[PDB]
């Protein structure tokens, strides 16, 4: 296996999903056959027995771990090796082990995590562990990083005293459990002065590279057990060699074959399509205040913006609106002229009814107009409430693209559930760069399963889950299916303005059968399956077509006077001549224009002197 199979992980902390079994099962479903945990390991409410075999396969966790209120005897997390811990439990600890006991004095007993030997960041918490045994003997300094040992507040209160006794041969009575295998494996303390980083043994040869995390199998940079910063294939790197090496000699830049792009923890040669590529040479997710997203030959580039910038409006639950966990009456204010939404959009029920707890006013249904300005979203969209007043999604009329670089649970770029809406009415939505679409739980929402999604998806692995929406059986009876003018490809509603692609032609945004060529009020021409109105100068023709272009240059006949094919209002006066000299022409009964005689100052009503009396 090239990559390790991942599970998304949860941040819900102490939220119990129904009963203990229900939560346990949600866990089982999530973390079954999981190799690397993207999120957090929340082992909460694990009661007596509830055998946790499937957890053995878990190797590491990006975030913190919370083991709380687990009366279970055995928690076999033997193959768990390391915790990056980029997030802390309550900004304090990387691991929180609390209240593992029952009323009857039965709690966590066996915990043979013999391979867990490193924690990059964060501290650890211990309290209320009566049944806990063996783990006590762990000499933590090997594992935890020096920076945090002051913040570490842990205590082994082995009140029961019914515990096992480490196999003698274990390194200085440090053991995770019974048997020779469960002896605590220490790879830090025995690294002699010379070796600053991790080591295999005491022999100075065994100095591992600094860039190793869990240890190494040799001194070479590739041999690291777990790459600290970046995992460039086998090798473990600090920062991807930039695109071009600075030449010491010439004081110039030379193209570097080693040059790569820093995408998260990987030095790659190519970013995921949707992601923004900088001239710096790192795959990024959004531009800062400096500049906006400059389209540069079909890839996003943060080319510097001169003077006023389009800027980025921090989406909900990010940057300047991280406190807020749903767009409400308060935060919505700061969305006046938003063109780029650098974040997500959470529309929760509490926003509309208002929250007593947070003292947030009820969101006014009338204030949904603000959203017309929004044109794109870097991340995903969640809508779990909609006002009674409106059934159509007017608010998102001019919502074009959802970039969805960040997805809810890394799986979905959009979610609309438990709504009262009837028609989708999204008549500018023509692309979802990446991320899945889930439409479910809509009582009376037609038009749902009519769109051709394959067109809108651009990336491998974009799935679609549209279920429990108003059956076509009912919709078709009341005529809530694709209008005559909407192509079979897809339709957003019953209106002719909500068609994805028009059958034949269209007047602006509204599909129609055929352009008004012969008769009708707007005399129009057909360009690119669209009808555009001729310039007023173009005189309507009963039988012949009126015009073949927007400008007045393409009129067959002029409404008033004629000056060639270019139909001008009247014979030009002051038209560009010699060094911008005013030119005077005279009209005729046949609407023909000819030059006057120089003499006539007040214009001329005929050739020569005879034209202009005074």
């Amino acid at each position: 296996l090239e990559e390790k199979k991942v599970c998304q992980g949860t941040s819900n902390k102490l939220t119990q999903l129904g009963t203990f079994e229900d939560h346990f099962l949600s866990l089982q479903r999530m973390f079954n056959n999981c190799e690397v945990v993207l999120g957090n390991l929340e082992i909460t409410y694990v009661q007596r027995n509830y055998d946790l075999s499937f957890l053995k396969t878990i190797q590491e966790v990006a975030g913190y771990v919370l083991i709380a209120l687990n009366t279970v005897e055995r928690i076999p997390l033997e193959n768990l090796q390391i915790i990056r811990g980029n997030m802390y439990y309550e900004n304090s600890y990387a691991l929180a082990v609390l209240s593992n006991y029952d009323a009857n004095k039965t709690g966590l007993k066996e915990l043979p995590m013999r391979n867990l030997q490193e924690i990059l960041h964060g501290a650890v918490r211990f309290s209320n562990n009566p049944a806990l045994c063996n783990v006590e003997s762990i000499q933590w300094r090997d594992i935890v990083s020096s920076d945090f040992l002051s913040n570490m507040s842990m205590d082994f209160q082995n009140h029961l005293g019914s515990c096992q006794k480490c196999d003698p041969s274990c390194p200085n009575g440090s053991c995770w459990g019974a048997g020779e295998e469960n002896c605590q494996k220490l790879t830090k303390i025995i690294c002699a002065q010379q070796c600053s980083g991790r080591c295999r043994g005491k022999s100075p040869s065994d100095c591992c590279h600094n860039q190793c995390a869990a240890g190494c199998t040799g001194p070479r940079e590739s041999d690291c057990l777990v790459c600290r910063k970046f995992r460039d294939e086998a090798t473990c790197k600090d920062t991807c060699p930039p695109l071009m090496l600075y030449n010491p000699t010439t004081y110039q830049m030379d193209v570097n074959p080693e040059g790569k792009y820093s995408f998260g923890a990987t030095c790659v040669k190519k970013c995921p399509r949707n992601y923004v590529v900088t001239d710096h040479g790192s795959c990024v997710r959004a531009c800062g205040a400096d500049s906006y997203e400059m389209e540069e030959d079909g890839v996003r580039k943060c080319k510097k913006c001169e003077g006023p910038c389009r800027k980025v409006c921090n989406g909900i639950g990010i940057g300047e609106f991280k406190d807020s966990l749903s767009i409400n009456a308060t935060n919505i204010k700061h969305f006046k002229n938003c063109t780029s939404i650098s974040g997500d959009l959470h529309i929760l029920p509490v926003a509309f009814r208002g929250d007593s707890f947070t003292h947030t006013p009820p969101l006014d249904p009338q204030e949904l107009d603000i959203l017309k300005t929004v044109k794109e979203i870097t991340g995903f969209l969640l809508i779990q409430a909609w006002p009674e007043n409106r059934t159509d999604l007017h608010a998102f009329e001019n919502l074009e693209i959802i970039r969805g670089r960040t997805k809810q649970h890394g799986q979905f770029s959009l979610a609309v559930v438990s709504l009262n809406i009837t028609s989708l009415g999204l008549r500018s939505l023509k692309e979802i760069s990446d991320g899945d679409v889930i439409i479910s739980g809509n009582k009376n929402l037609c038009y749902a399963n009519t769109i051709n999604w394959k067109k809108l998806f651009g990336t491998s692995g974009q799935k679609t889950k549209i279920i429990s929406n108003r059956g076509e059986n009912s919709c078709k009876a009341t005529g809530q299916v694709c209008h005559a003018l909407c192509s079979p490809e897809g339709c957003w509603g019953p209106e002719p303005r909500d068609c994805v692609s028009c059958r034949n032609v269209s007047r602006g945004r509204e599909c129609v059968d055929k352009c008004n060529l012969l008769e009708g009020e707007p005399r129009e021409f057909v360009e690119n399956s669209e009808c555009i109105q001729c310039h007023p100068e173009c005189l309507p023709q009963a039988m012949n077509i009126t015009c073949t272009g927007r400008g007045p240059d393409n009129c067959i006949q002029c409404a008033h006077y004629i000056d060639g094919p270019h139909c001008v209002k009247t014979c030009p006066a002051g038209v560009m001549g010699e060094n911008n000299t005013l030119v005077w022409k005279y009209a005729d009964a046949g609407h023909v224009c000819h030059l006057c005689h120089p003499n006539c100052t007040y214009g001329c009503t005929g050739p020569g002197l005879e034209g202009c009396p005074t």
């Epitope: 000499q139 009575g173 440090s174 303390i189 025995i190 002699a192 002065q193």
Partner: nanobody
């Protein structure tokens, strides 16, 4: 997070017997592993012995079989029986402690006693 203090440093006849002690100034003594270190005058500071907070002993090879480190949780003290002494033993002796490690590296113990001179006759 607690202080320390030695006792017993002095002069003895080559091949004699002695008994050193290290008293912890504070609380939670049982939680701290205890270690002895020595520095020969005009040399660098070197490891002597240790005993984990889990009551696991460990000796340096020089003193192994001649020295017997020990600890008494009740009295918050530690001891070191030293027999068949050698003129090579003359050094400045310290005792360090630590809750979260029982290693041999001088760097891993960050709470230190103040030490005493120990001499063995020529």
């Amino acid at each position: 997070q607690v202080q320390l203090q030695e006792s017993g440093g002095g002069s003895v006849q080559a091949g004699g017997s002695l008994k050193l002690s290290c008293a912890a100034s504070g609380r939670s003594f049982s939680t701290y592993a205890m270690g002895w270190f020595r520095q020969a005058p005009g040399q660098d500071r070197e490891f002597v012995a240790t005993i984990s907070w889990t009551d696991s002993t460990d000796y340096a090879d020089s003193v192994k079989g001649r020295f017997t480190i020990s600890r008494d949780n009740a009295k918050n003290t530690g001891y070191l029986q030293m027999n068949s002494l050698k003129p090579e033993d003359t050094a400045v002796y310290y005792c360090a402690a630590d809750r979260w490690a029982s290693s041999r590296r001088n760097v891993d113990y960050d709470y230190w006693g103040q030490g005493t001179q120990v001499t063995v006759s020529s």
